[PDB]
Amino acid sequence: VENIVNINESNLQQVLEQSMTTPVLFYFWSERSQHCLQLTPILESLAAQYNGQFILAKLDCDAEQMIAAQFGLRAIPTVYLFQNGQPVDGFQGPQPEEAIRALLDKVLPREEELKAQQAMQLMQESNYTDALPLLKDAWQLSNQNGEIGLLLAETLIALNRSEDAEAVLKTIPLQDQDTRYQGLVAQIELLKQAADTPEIQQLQQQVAENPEDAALATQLALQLHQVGRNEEALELLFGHLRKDLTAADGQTRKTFQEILAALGTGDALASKYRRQLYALLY
Ligand SMILES: [Ca+2]
Fold it and tell me: Cα(237) to centroid of ligand 1, in Å?
């Protein structure tokens, strides 16, 4: 309905009780009035611009005289803002477009809330790829608000970015560490445990004991890669390459390159490392 309702006998109470969550801007107007002529275009174009953020509710004062008298109407035009069932602000007369913003600006949700709401819907539709940029933006804007943090972390997990999700979960304030947080943490914990293999543990010990042995570290990097611990695998190999490009008789570089190939050109971690490798080699 372009978010504009003409009010009559049948929809006054139904929109008065729809103000319970959606802000309603009642617009008392007349086709007779020169104040309305340049308020109406300002008002409608904001209705369509905000798209369901508020309802512009027009009451034709010539057509609906009973309802207008019951509003206490004293001038045309009059606009009143209705929320939680109740009138909360308004004005009589015509006004600049930024005056009307000021009015709207108080009651309308913040950009990060709007983005978080859109992302929540996309998450519901299992569209995590599109939720992610909105959640990144909303999280930043909100100064890393914990509830948005939880959405972002869940979205990162679904996109197989558990390390990034874990970093976001580290930021969640203690008061927000409730059932949803616990569930995400438990998921990350089980993932880390599942990737913490006996074979990796004994290689990690052996590397600790002989940190210069590039062939050992390369073995370990391979087994880390195979359980998805790529940040660790690449960091470990690259450290060896920085010391010696021919490390483990060429094998360190070869394994490093083979891992980057296996991650594919769409992987952001692999892309970082490709660029670092080129600068190192040449
Ligand atoms: Ca260089």
Answer: 18
